[PDB]
């Protein structure tokens, strides 16, 4: 089924332009967080900090210079505290982006450069691939994922007993369309007949509860027929 998968990927890629254009708040939060911090630093320059006036010039002009120093110290200490708080909050903010750069390096390595088997690291679904797109101070990754859909209900039995030897399914589940027993791949329904090829025979039919009797077909014997 190649064409369906191709259009489903192609249309889904189309919606991203509109949905992104309904989104980038996490990236714009950083631009805003930085602006507020720089202006708080500029506005603190325009704060008295327990001094007669913010302007240093006027303080020098309207006060005697030897006596003026203690008032000047009041402004410098306040501004050094203001800068020190800027640097300290910026060091704490840097380690939030370093944590995010580390998850982006990891998502690039384990999703763009390979297929992750980790659950919900690369999209909600089973990851198929992932594509990197640059964004202004970050990365947007268009995680592609396979989402199971359209479920159907069937009766399941743990082992199938033929000739008194339990037969367990090598890869898959044993499922029944009400009357006929079949071995299916687990994440997509593909009913298939039960033959020794898809079945591993271990044990006898008296130890597992739920074994259902049926016929596990023999492939070699009919060609002999």
């Amino acid at each position: 089924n190649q064409k369906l998968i191709a259009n489903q990927f192609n249309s889904a890629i189309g919606k991203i332009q509109d949905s992104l254009s309904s989104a980038l708040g996490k990236l714009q939060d950083v631009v805003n967080h930085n602006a507020q911090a720089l202006n708080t630093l500029v506005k603190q320059l325009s704060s008295k900090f327990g001094a007669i006036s913010s302007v240093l010039n006027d303080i020098f002009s309207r006060l005697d210079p030897p006596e003026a120093e203690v008032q000047i110290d009041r402004l410098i200490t306040g501004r050094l505290q203001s800068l020190q708080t800027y640097v300290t909050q910026q060091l704490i903010r840097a380690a939030e982006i370093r944590a995010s750069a580390n998850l982006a390096a990891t998502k690039m390595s384990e999703c763009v450069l390979g297929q992750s088997k980790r659950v919900d690291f690369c999209g909600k679904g089973y990851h198929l691939m992932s594509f990197p797109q640059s964004a202004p101070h970050g990365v947007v990754f268009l995680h592609v994922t396979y989402v199971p859909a359209q479920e159907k209900n069937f009766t399941t039995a743990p082992a199938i007993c033929h000739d008194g030897k339990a037969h367990f399914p090598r890869e898959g589940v044993f499922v029944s369309n009400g009357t006929h027993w079949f071995v299916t791949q687990r994440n997509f329904y593909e009913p298939q007949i039960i033959t020794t090829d898809n079945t591993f025979v271990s044990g006898n039919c008296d130890v597992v509860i739920g074994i259902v009797n049926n016929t596990v077909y023999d492939p070699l014997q009919p060609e002999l027929d």
């Binding site: 998968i5 990927f9 999209g123 199971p148 479920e151």
Partner: protein, 73 residues
């Protein structure tokens, strides 16, 4: 003229509703508020109840797929 007490405090201007919907403006303590037309405060609904049908012998197998290109920024 609409007054109502919640653990967070007294909400004035909003009428408590016994209907349940998702959280638009999260007031606090499990109560969320939105704009009906007046401003209505309600208890948030965690989601829609589904009871998976557990049974000793029943399985459900997914019969089609979807390919979803989600985006993480």
């Amino acid at each position: 003229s609409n007054v109502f007490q919640t653990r967070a405090g007294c909400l004035i201007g909003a009428e408590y509703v016994n209907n349940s919907y998702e959280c638009d403006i999260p007031i606090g303590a499990g109560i969320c508020a939105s704009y009906q037309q007046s401003i209505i405060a309600y208890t948030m609904s965690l989601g829609a109840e589904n009871s998976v049908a557990y049974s000793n012998n029943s399985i459900a197998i997914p019969t089609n797929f979807t390919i979803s290109v989600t985006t993480e920024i």
